[PDB]
């Protein structure tokens, strides 16, 4: 197949740096640029600059200026970006893509490489049970939920009853305070089994070793 | 830069039909060549762009006859024909006549249901957080669409703003609908100097505010 391949996913602190390859392959490597693409949470995705193979000398869009420098090791026909000094605002997926110079369009992209920038140190979640306080039947349904709060690295596994629960389960997207992960997840089941029968959380932190089962106990 | 601005941000579009995708360029993508380069990206969830179509209307190998391009000097339209599950995700405009290919906008596909209202559960802090000092209040608001809901957290009455915390789940790949949590976090001492914690959620399909609480 032909493609761009990326490097694996980084976690850096600030200050530091970071190099991303984009090793190209199946395609005549000097007659395409090499684009590069930031794409940023909920920012838009930003072309960064350009890579030309052709001569080697690189163009930089104003905002990636000096910091951010275009490598390149051709006989490889890899291409590299790094960043120096990182920033906590660098934390993005960086793209590479084959940039065209007819129709000027980028048609193959790289899988995409994530910079996480923290000064946060690896610490496991605490799992909290969320029990009613007393509510009743909506229309005979209860919804539990555990909140896993306090996290770092990303990601964190959450599941109900060891995977026999995934109707109702809605597991939110990881959300911060201080540096650190808080995020919940919510089962749904009829009012028959609990507590008639029992309902647990098993959340699971692989970045520090750590499963943690917080039966949900009643109120 | 030329600054790409193409709505909706969400397109409900029901399975099936023609959809209209519309961008538009705050400069016109003509250039002195004498031709328009815009061009159209698709990225499913959580992958990397595909091209679809290039030079406001080509389509790019692959990219079957149900999708075509047209527009001109700054009002582009990606339109499906008949949408299929397949083709499902947000979609980037980008052109690459001047410096530099800006992309805008993010429209993206979802699909379209009956309005749901959300199943608002609310949960006061466990045992164990308390132990340990802290106090966080949980309300799920559950199964809804659409999408949009407002969530108000009245602490005696008082509305509280901070402290707060939401997050959504883009649309339930089995149900259509929506979910969102909010969670109040204070401290245990900013928690016991008062009784009754309320979440509020004012959604489309509501005449008065859904509220619930519990009493501290
Ligand atoms: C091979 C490759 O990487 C391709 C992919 C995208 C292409 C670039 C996209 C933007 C256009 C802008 C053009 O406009 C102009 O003539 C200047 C005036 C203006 O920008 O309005 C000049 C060349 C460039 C910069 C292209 C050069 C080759 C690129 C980089």
């Known amino acids: 197949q032909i493609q761009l391949v990326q490097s694996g996913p980084e976690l850096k602190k600030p200050g530091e740096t970071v190099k991303i390859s984009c090793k190209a392959s199946?395609?005549?490597?000097?007659?395409?640029?090499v684009n590069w693409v930031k794409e940023a949470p909920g920012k838009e995705l930003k072309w960064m600059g350009w890579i030309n193979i052709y001569t080697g000398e690189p163009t930089y869009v104003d905002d990636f200026k000096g910091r951010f420098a275009f490598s390149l090791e051709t006989s490889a026909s890899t291409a590299y970006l790094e960043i120096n000094n990182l920033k906590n605002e660098d934390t993005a997926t960086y793209f590479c893509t084959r940039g065209d110079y007819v129709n000027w369009y980028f048609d193959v992209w790289g899988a995409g490489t994530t910079v996480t920038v923290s000064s946060a140190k690896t610490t496991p979640p605490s799992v909290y049970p969320l029990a009613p306080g007393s509510a009743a039947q909506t229309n005979s349904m209860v919804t539990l939920g555990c909140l896993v709060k306090g996290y770092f690295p990303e990601p964190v596994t959450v599941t109900w009853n060891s995977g026999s629960l995934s109707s109702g389960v809605h597991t939110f997207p990881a959300v911060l305070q201080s540096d650190l992960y808080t995020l919940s997840s919510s089962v749904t089941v009829p009012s028959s089994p609990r507590p008639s029968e029992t309902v647990t959380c098993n959340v699971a932190h692989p970045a520090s070793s750590t499963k943690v089962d917080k039966k949900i106990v009643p109120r | 830069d030329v600054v790409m601005t193409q709505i909706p941000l969400s397109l409900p579009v029901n399975l099936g039909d023609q959809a209209s995708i519309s961008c538009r360029s705050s400069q016109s993508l003509i250039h002195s060549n004498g031709n328009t380069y815009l061009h159209w990206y698709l990225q499913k969830p959580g992958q990397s762009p595909k091209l679809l179509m290039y030079k406001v209307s080509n389509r790019f190998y692959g990219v079957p006859d149900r999708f075509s391009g047209s527009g001109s000097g700054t009002d582009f339209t990606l339109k499906i024909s008949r949408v299929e599950a397949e083709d499902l995700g947000i979609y980037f405009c980008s052109q690459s006549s001047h410096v530099p290919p800006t992309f805008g906008g993010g429209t993206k596909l979802e699909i379209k249901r009956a309005d749901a209202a959300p199943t608002v559960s609310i949960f006061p802090p466990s045992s164990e957080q308390l132990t340990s000092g802290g106090a966080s209040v949980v309300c799920f608001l559950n199964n809804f669409y659409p999408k949009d809901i407002n969530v108000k957290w009245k602490i005696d009455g008082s509305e509280r703003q901070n402290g707060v915390l939401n997050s959504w789940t883009d649309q339930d790949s089995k149900d259509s609908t929506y979910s969102m949590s909010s969670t109040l976090t204070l401290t245990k001492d900013e928690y016991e100097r008062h009784n009754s914690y309320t979440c509020e959620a004012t959604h489309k399909t509501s005449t008065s505010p859904i509220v619930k609480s519990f009493n501290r």
């Open positions: 199946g395609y005549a490597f000097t007659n395409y640029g």
